[PDB]
Structure formats: C-alpha cells, structure tokens
C-alpha cells in the first residue's frame, strides 16, 4: 500500500523543452522526445503501465515512436512496467549487466530481498557499459554506473539538443542492508563509495531522480504550473543528493562497525 501511494497518478507535464514527466507521484518516468524517436527512462510498477502509456498519449506522442527504454535498477518500482511498455513500444531496452540478469529473473534472487518482490521478466536488448553513449535526434544518453543500492544501479546523463545537461539519478539508499562482509554483495561498500565520487563530479542543469521526493517533484511542478519556466533547473540538486545520501550511509556504516 506504500507502492499504492507511490503510484498515485499525476497529470503529465513538461520539465523542459523535450523533457516530459509521465510517471506517478513518487515513481519517476521521463520521456525524452526527438524528431527521430523518443527515449523513456524507467517505467514504474506493472500496475501503472497503462497509466504511463496513457500519459504519453495525453501529451501528443505515440508509443510506437519510443525507440529506447532505459532502466535505473531492476526492482519492481522501476522495472515492473517495462515488459508491457516494451511490448506496446517495439522499443529496445537498455540496462547494465546486473540489471539485465535480474530483469530476466523477474526481480527474483535479489541480493537483499530474495524472491519477495517479483515482476514480469524482461529481455534486455542492449547491454549498457559504464560511460556508453547512445545518440538520437540530437540528444545524447550516457550511462553512469552508480552501484550500491543494487549491483547494477545505473544513473543516466542526458545532453539535450539545446546543450543543457540532465542527470537522472538512481537511488543510493541502503535501509536494512548488511554492509560489512555482505555474503550476497561483497563489494557493496566500495561500490557505493565510488558511486558518490562519480555523481559528485558530475555537473548538471536539470536534476532528476527515480523517486520524486528526492528532487522536489511536486514543489517544482506546482511552481512551473504557476509560470516559473525554469523551476526544474537545479544546479545544486545532485551535490545535495549525494551529500545527504553519503551522510546517512556513513552514519549507518559507523553504527554497524561499532558492535
Ligand atoms: Zn530501489
Ligand atoms: Zn525498493
Ligand atoms: Zn525505487
Ligand atoms: Zn552481461
Ligand atoms: Zn546472463
Ligand atoms: Zn528463487
């Protein structure tokens, strides 16, 4: 029922020329539109897939014009709807190796959740490597591997046609994670530390994240509706996101080491 609250619909809107929000109240889904086809970053829950397509069409765009679907990490609140969106799309799915493996499993054998939260399996069509780039209609999409929350967690850097940089950040949360000598994910700590360094060295004009509460979705949305054209321009958003995630992580790790 917390996913129920996260999946409450929002009216789609423009974040920026060529950048559209088509997700829910707290589960992000971003459509990048170009004259050569579109990119969809993340999907949400399987139950929200009809709402996502519905949102895309309410903006005046066609599912058949979506060429790529990118995934941040392969859990149900972001990959759950990809299977059906892929089918309605004909699009090719992009994801890191570890995300591809988990998505083929339907979310099962999660290093922390086991088989607790499955979703429709997906076949990834294009395996993403760190720093790999895709070009479409003047837009560039680049993968930034940011593991920690999951072994394959991926952030996404978009260079828009107008030259401005967008960063779609994956989660860095580790609630309830065993951080010291984790049997199922032994490289977690070094992974998340490299992720902090990678993200904090990234310049950004438009800061987004796969959970709306973490980049002020509802506040920025209301502000833009009232006429603030640049409400989603947030050049300090990623630095603050990393600082607060790192602060919480180091406190959690310090507590785990103080047995
Ligand atoms: Zn997650
Ligand atoms: Zn989760
Ligand atoms: Zn999530
Ligand atoms: Zn692979
Ligand atoms: Zn494999
Ligand atoms: Zn199993």
Numbering used by the authors: 15 to 273
Copy text from the publication:
Classes A, C and D (serine-β-lactamases, SBLs) use a catalytic site serine residue to initiate inactivation of the antibiotic, while Class B (metallo-β-lactamases, MBLs) relies on a Zn2+-activated hydroxide. MBLs contain catalytic centres that can accommodate two closely spaced Zn2+ ions bound in the α and β sites with similar yet distinct sequence motifs (B1: His116, His118, His196 and Asp120, Cys221, His263 (i.e., HHH/DCH) for the α and β sites, respectively; B2: NHH/DCH; B3: HHH/DHH). For B3-type MBLs two variations of the canonical active site motif have been observed, QHH/DHH in GOB-1/18 from the opportunistic pathogen Elizabethkingia meningoseptica and HRH/DQK in SPR-1 from Serratia proteamaculans (variations shown in bold).
B3-RQK MBLs have three distinct aa variations in the active site motif, including two in the β site. We determined the crystal structures of the mature CSR-1 protein and CSR-1trunc, and compared them to structures of B3 and B3-Q MBLs. However, no metal ions were observed in the crystal structures of CSR-1 and CSR-1trunc, suggesting reduced metal ion affinity. To probe the role of these residues single, double and triple mutants of CSR-1trunc (i.e., CSR-1trunc,sm, CSR-1trunc,dm and CSR-1trunc,tm) were generated to create variants where either the α, the β or both metal binding sites are identical to the canonical B3 MBL motif. These mutations had no significant effect on the overall structures, however, in CSR-1trunc,sm electron density indicates the presence of one bound Zn2+ in the α-site, while in the double and triple mutants both the α- and β-sites are occupied by Zn2+ ions. The increasing Zn2+ binding capacity of CSR-1trunc as a function of introduced mutations was paralleled by enhanced ex vivo and in vitro activities, especially for the double and triple mutants; importantly, these two variants are also resistant to CA. Thus, the variations in the β-site of B3-RQK MBLs are responsible for the loss of catalytic activity and sensitivity to CA. Mutation of the B3-RQK active site to restore the native B3 motif resulted in increased metal affinity, catalytic activity and resistance to CA. This can be primarily attributed to the restoration of the canonical histidine in position 263 of the β-site, and raises the possibility of modifying CA to effectively bind in the presence of His263, thereby increasing the therapeutic range of this widely used antibiotic resistance drug.
